[PDB]
Symmetry: D3
Subunit: 227 residues, 6 copies
């Protein structure tokens, strides 16, 4: 929908963002990704400091975009990318707290599914519980890539919380259910992708137990998904 670009949150015109977007929470990290991996970089967004860049990675056009923190924030960005900019694929990368005791610091978690605190699923009027899943194909390509590069990974359920600071201790039930790791965004992305018939995947590096070399390895898995 070219008529809806630029948006209140994104200064890009239609066509300035690639069909594959890598997203991360921190704009400083998004900039480091652009500087490290992309050639011919142009910035298409600086609205609200949520920097977005478009460049080339091994000859294919690729965009990297900041999404801020929490499901409502990434929801706004992903909705616009999928529905207004013609984006096909969003891969979110970031750090996470491990719930699963067998995960080591720097292990890659591939988020096949995302559990969640209520966000904006109510706005879809779903008469039961909706299970947020990644796109099977991105998930399969991310696993094949980790296996090809011989990196340590686990694929399974993550948890997209609305809180960073817990007023209680609410982690026990998720741990008992086999959830691998906690972050704050994936479930919103998966829902929006599913509604749009587009592909999303969240990949995470474990950084806390509930770095540059480890994180770089997560990047090589993610970047291998660029199309």
């Amino acid at each position: 929908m070219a008529e809806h670009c630029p948006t209140p949150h994104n200064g890009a015109k239609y066509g300035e963002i690639a069909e594959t977007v890598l997203m991360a929470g921190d704009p400083l990290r998004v900039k480091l990704l652009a500087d490290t991996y992309l050639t011919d970089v142009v910035q298409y967004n600086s609205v609200r400091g949520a920097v977005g860049y478009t460049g080339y990675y091994k000859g294919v056009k690729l965009s990297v975009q900041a999404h801020g923190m929490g499901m409502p924030s990434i929801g706004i960005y992903a909705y616009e990318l999928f529905n207004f900019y013609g984006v096909k694929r969003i891969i979110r990368i970031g750090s996470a707290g491990a719930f699963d005791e067998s995960l080591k610091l720097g292990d890659i978690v591939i988020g096949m599914g995302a559990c969640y605190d209520s966000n904006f699923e109510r706005q879809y009027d779903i008469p039961g519980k909706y299970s947020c899943i990644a796109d099977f194909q991105l998930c399969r390509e991310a696993v094949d890539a980790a296996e090809k590069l011989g990196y340590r990974y686990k694929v399974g359920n993550i948890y997209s919380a609305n809180y960073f600071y817990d007023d209680g201790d609410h982690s026990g039930a998720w741990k008992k259910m086999g959830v691998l790791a906690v972050e704050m965004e994936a479930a919103a992305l998966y829902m929006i992708a599913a509604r749009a018939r587009k592909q999303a995947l969240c990949m995470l590096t474990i950084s806390d137990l509930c770095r540059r070399t480890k994180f770089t390895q997560m990047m090589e898995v993610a970047l291998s998904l660029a199309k």
Copy 2:
């Protein structure tokens, strides 16, 4: 584990059920699968007519077991299989109604995730919404096997309903969300397997259309062949 066998629902003693169980709702279908694909068949269960057989498929030990209809029913059998009988993987095959308009009668759906009506999940005291997912490895192998056999398949989200007959029309929101198909069991299986740290996957054949003409079937062997290729 062994001390809990036999159970109120399963006459098998510990060890009489293989590490891989293939499950279907209908005991007549389970019997067929046993008669068609397994050799040296022993029936380990007849409790409540929920038949269970152990035999060899291509010389590899395998069990096949009826689970009845609905999440509470499959919950009982899968909880017992995973927690008392030492079962490592359950592959469920079944029929489903299509929500996605590109699915035709006889297409196969691989349930990567399962949406659900509230069942027994309250028992887990979960402070949010739990997303039910299949075992990824099973998922991938099922896709590869379907591809190699040349079957029409889709992999994605399915919906485990508590009803076969809808008092209204509640399929709309699920359809908007991209959910592929409706059955009555998968979410319970997936939850129980995740808690047990075991593997589960649900595969389905579209037997009725929940859109358009609503055409229904009066042709399940292709799905059995994908399922059988997962046995270990």
Copy 3:
């Protein structure tokens, strides 16, 4: 209303329209259903073997009735009961089953008449009910069942039962039901009651206590199961019309 010949046979029932009588007794276990038909019915015809959910139609003291397996859990009984009331013209369904005792005055073999059924989620959402729906039995069946147990001199209680969606619980979610005076736990009644209410038809669940959910947790042997469900079946059979 209640009769739709063109929807018979269904995906779950091989019966043609008219092969099922106006009163159906239902139990979870197809072996109990067969036993009941073998013990009590004459002129018996099997009208269903679909999914092993055996169903028979026969006569008891000159009255035609059907007996049918319904499998385990609310979604399962919900399928069969919906079809029976909406497609097969059934007027009355009496569920007979086994149950775990919550009320400590109940002994093994005691009969519980489910005037009401508490429940974990079943069909309520699909009916779009904007509050809490209380699942109750048909008063007339309830009253007949109590009168029969009373005339036959059986130990019974009439009150609330609980239709659970689980058999296993890693913890203990039973305390609050006991406090509320719930008598017994099973897994089906509430869905039956809701489906019958929707259809304006009659339903009742009766139970025999086969396990105690208190104390040392005594349970019936297989022999006691075979022989101590007689009293309930007989009460149930006298409700057929």
Copy 4:
């Protein structure tokens, strides 16, 4: 527990209230009941105008008491009566709106079950849906009494609403489910009676259709009075 009587809502000392209580929402109707049917009447409560009287009906000691409107109101009174005053049976009588289209003004509805909006349940920590039911024996006796007098009645499900005025129209699903009539109190009474192991029943006269007034209420009162032991 005599130690808890009188209460903040009830001036009665332990023993001033009989083992059977008839309850209605309206204190004026409660006074009329005592004046009409009871002999040797003593008023045991006037706190908040929620009048309570004790007297004899055909030689049997009986109490009648106002409960006001809504589940939180009846819950306070019923809780005190069952847990503090040694009350064994409460029969509530009142008016209701019809949901079932075959009900005429003045029909009697016997509430075997009561559907509800939230009132009391959450405070009991119940991990599922609690079905609120009447005492079977009382329900049976009411049905026999109505049948014997040959009154038009139905016995089945009622709905205890938290509202008299509906902002939209939320009656449709209740009607589809066969719920007979709407009032505002029964389910709380039923829940509190079940928790206490005591007996309760709600009976109603249809006064409005949600789809001679005094004389209509009298038939119900006569059925109610039949149940007093």
Copy 5:
């Protein structure tokens, strides 16, 4: 809407109720307020014993009306008043238990917001959580009057419970959230006022402490110590 008066719960004809209504739960207390503070008193209601009177307070027509106990009861009366009788302003007065440990017996609590157990928000078809609030202007005038007269008060969140008798102990989480006091009515009044675009406020005198040793007002203090709250409420008469 004159055509809806009298109602099943209120014998008044349209115009017999003033634009400002003071409400309390207890009819005995409503009668006392009328006799004490109003001149030219006419009783407009005695239906269900929920007495209502109209008179003058310092030259301004004012009505006082009983509302019974609980959100459904006050909901009926408030709905009628705002939607049929042309009422602009309802101030509820009453007693409450303290959750906040710095409140003493006799302190005034002004309910800027009301937490609640579900009573009848479902009937409004709200697709999230609705926060029940008082009218700011009334709230501001109550706080000013309390300060000007030097009364001990706190202004903040109250809790409208569905129960007087707790089967368990559910007070902990409210206390953690800073909720000041528990009563049984305010949230429904506030929701109905907001829907009608009218003004409502609940003020409370602490009559029991729901913390520590559970101190209660004596029967004598209950009879006596609601006068301060009255002068605050009466400041709001318009």
Copy 6:
């Protein structure tokens, strides 16, 4: 708690943030606020580009900080500020869409309460419905400032949504309940402040009318027509 600063979201050490913090979603707006109104400005945070500055307004030390978009984002910042940095009051300022049809572009809305979609009430284990309210004293001060300066304002309920794009139309019931305006942050701030026993207020400038013909502020108006709100907000610094 000096030991918990800096945090993973904030590079400030304890004491680098004043006891009053004005927060807005957009770091470019926060920067503009610091440059236009504050003297002796020091930047204490650039973590995640969520800039924060501390400086002086009319002799009074204050901070201004970006909070990003949505309740979980503001929840992170506000939790840290109240619990680690010793902050006493946080005033959120922002733009909002009007639900109330008497509101014009540029009207100021003071959020006495905030309705909400789920944020982290679940995390507080509350056994009913919690009404999110502002601090009464900030609320009174804001209204007083707006009156003395003569600005057009309304005080009442706002709605903190979890969505900006509505997959349908869920606005009807909020409008019906008399909610004034929609934004995405206030309820979480209010809840956290209540738990912490600290003060919070959200004030909004109407930038879009979610009714009628749908008038929206010009890009020039969005850039420049927020000064009236900012002046009210600044007068709350102590």
